[PDB]
Amino acid sequence: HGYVSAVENGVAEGRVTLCKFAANGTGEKNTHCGAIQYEPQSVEGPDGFPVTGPRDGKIASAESALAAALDEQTADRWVKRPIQAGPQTFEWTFTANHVTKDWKYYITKPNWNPNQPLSRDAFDLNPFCVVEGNMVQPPKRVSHECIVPEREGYQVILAVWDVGDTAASFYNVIDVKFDPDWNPAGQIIPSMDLSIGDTVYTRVFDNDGENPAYRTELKIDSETLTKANQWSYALATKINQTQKQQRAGQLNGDQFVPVYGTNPIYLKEGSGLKSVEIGYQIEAPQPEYSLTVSGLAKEYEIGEQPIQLDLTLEAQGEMSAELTVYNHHQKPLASWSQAMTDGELKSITLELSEAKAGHHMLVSRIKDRDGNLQDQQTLDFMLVE
Amino acid sequence: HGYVSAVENGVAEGRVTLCKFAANGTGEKNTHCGAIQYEPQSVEGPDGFPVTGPRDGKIASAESALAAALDEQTADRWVKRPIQAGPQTFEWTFTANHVTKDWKYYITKPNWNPNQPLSRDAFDLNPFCVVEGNMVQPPKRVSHECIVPEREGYQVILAVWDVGDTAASFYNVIDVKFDPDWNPAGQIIPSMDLSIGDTVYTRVFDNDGENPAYRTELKIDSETLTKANQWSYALATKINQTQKQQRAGQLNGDQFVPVYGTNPIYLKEGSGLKSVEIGYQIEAPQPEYSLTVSGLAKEYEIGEQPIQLDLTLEAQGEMSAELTVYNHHQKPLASWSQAMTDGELKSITLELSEAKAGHHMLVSRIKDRDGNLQDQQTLDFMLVE
């Protein structure tokens, strides 16, 4: 288990790595990577690439269910790390120890299409770098000296770690860009949808702090602008249309090009401008959410049987409800969660994993359809002899 | 804009900080923080705490919409960072320059309840540490020498950064646990739901590598076990139930207590065991999703009016669809996304923001009900004068 990293001498972090760790130097992360963001070390799949191995369109994820998001492929989806042709050092960090057959590195063909899913077709299937593992366990960090072929613009390098004792390999794709008076100073991340009537805007900082003369404002006045990727694109575009000392969008050649996704923000050298943050104004209404819990007694008497909470839940709003029972020692004795529709009544019974006299509590959490906590309520009850 | 960090001499990172950055030493992250994970610098709310400011239950989020997930409060929800009473150093990192009135630090009362929403009553409202800002802008990173009061177990520290020239403050709560032959070895992280028929299991490593004899496996054989927090609890519980050299759960006193959430894994010093990773065996092959796109022509002539794509879309499986048009230079010219039900037919029209002769692509991405990418397909088309 492990991943391509850059803590020692590595030229560039793996795609999956940047889901968990910030890029060296720039601080960027990849976004919306799904579950693999919590275990970048586990992009493991069937060995035998390219003859067998992960199938086309499932190379970046290695067919792992946790890493499905990595298989998306467009020109603007992923953070790209600077690189040059010739001698370069690639670095792996291992969280677990495996006997190793070898490591192989592949690179996209010059004619690869950055908007098609990665495939054998997209790569030169003759690896540009191979390092022998000698069927022994490697140390916890390794550095590989490779010769990176000549390329221009955006390319993808596929690092494959072939393990010796199992029918498995680890696959880490790497997004690189082959190598002025514009300084990065923040970015527009599309991380939350908006509602009509809302407004998203920049907060621009000069030498004296925030300065409203430099703000750019986008009113959310159409259903299309409610989508995060859409208002992001639009705010980035409006910055370019209306400002002299600010630009936004991904760097494509010498141009700043707003995309439907993340849009970095840049400030003009000599402008005196320091950075930009984003602010959100929501004139919007607060849907009301509510989960009425009924059926909890004041006391439960310990009998020959396991203690049971027979409860009724009434939902106001569309939600996910999560209930947990804790004894007084912070030990969880029962838990339950389910989606509930606006106006739904449900009858449930929670069985306590154990019954000792004392103060207990039921914690009920309400999350909206988009998954954020709207409310938490904690109800006290007692077990008695 | 800024957050409580541990890049230099800070004792413990802010809760929000750990949504983006891995913890010092352990590499632990807070999970499912929502949008604020992409901007930990932005937990800004009304000033005047505790007399005014964010209301009870919205202290951790500072009433910010990005940060609502932070208001959840249970004994096991958040990563707890070790601390001791007495002299300690707290650290802030700033992304943006604000004139500062002061920094204040509060700690929970010894009788606080870790399972109730954070409130003024949970805190000693006499701050244990105050540092004057003198109404000037601070350096991009500051270190504050404080004296932490005597406490045991889990406590919350609220750090408040009061900004001088606006009616706002930044609020960063910090989860701390006040201070033998059980070594930290890995983590069961509830990042994904499973299916009946699946199995989740441990992969235990000793000096010879993966050792199959030490494996613990859990069959998902009930509706209940499909939920991530549920199988996490169950696997940790089964480890404790069947292994002599391994423990799983959050440390509560001297005991390892499995929780419905993240369960750390420990190995007995001198057992020969080094670490533990998690593996997943998934049985159901399905489903297949498809979005068939009809009406894309080979060529389109420019053009007195903007060029328009008359498409018919057909959905297989419940999904959300995303379409994007890219020109040859990979500037996005149009974007669309919406949910579709299994078998739905939708006809739409996409208008290109510009019409120049050359090779174009229409990219579609299918996400399943859970948000997991299921397919990507791209069609080539050409614009001509």
Numbering used by the authors:
A (entry chain A), B (entry chain B): 24 to 202, 209 to 414
What does the report in the manuscript say about this coordinate set?
Colonization of these different niches involves an N-acetylglucosamine binding protein (GbpA) that has been reported to mediate bacterial attachment to both marine chitin and mammalian intestinal mucin through an unknown molecular mechanism. Recent studies have suggested that Vibrio cholerae secretes a protein that mediates adhesion in aquatic environments, e.g. to plankton, as well as adhesion to human intestinal cells. This protein, GlcNAc binding protein A (GbpA) binds to N-acetylglucosamine (GlcNAc)- containing carbohydrates, such as chitin, and is secreted by the type 2 secretion system. We report structural studies that reveal that GbpA possesses an unusual, elongated, four-domain structure, with domains 1 and 4 showing structural homology to chitin binding domains. Finally, mouse virulence assays show that only the first three domains of GbpA are required for colonization. These results explain how GbpA provides structural/functional modular interactions between V. cholerae, intestinal epithelium and chitinous exoskeletons.
Although extensive efforts were made to crystallise full-length GbpA, GbpAD1–3 was the longest construct that could be crystallised. The GbpAD1–3 structure was solved by SAD phasing, and refined against 1.8 Å synchrotron diffraction data. The structure of GbpAD1–3 reveals three distinct domains rich in β-structure, linked by disordered loops. Domain 1 (GbpAD1) comprises a four-stranded and a three-stranded β-sheet forming a β-sandwich. Between β-strands 1 and 3, a 65-residue loop forms a pseudo-domain, which consists of short α-helices, a β-strand, and loops. There are also two disulphide bonds formed: one in the loop/helical region (Cys-42 and Cys-56) and one linking β-strands 4 and 5 (Cys-152 and Cys-169). A structural similarity search with the Dali server identified chitin binding protein 21 (CBP21) from S. marcescens, which is part of the CAZy Carbohydrate Binding Module family 33 (CBM33) as a structural homologue (RMSD = 0.9 Å for 168 Cαatoms, 47% sequence identity). Structural similarity searches with DALI revealed only distant structural similarities between domain 2 of GbpA and the β-domain of the flagellin protein p5 (Z = 4.0, RMSD = 2.9 Å for 68 Cα atoms). A more significant structural match was observed for domain 3 of GbpA. This domain has an immunoglobulin fold with significant structural similarity to over 200 structures in the PDB. The crystal structure of GbpAD1–3 lacks the C-terminal domain 4, comprising residues 415–485.
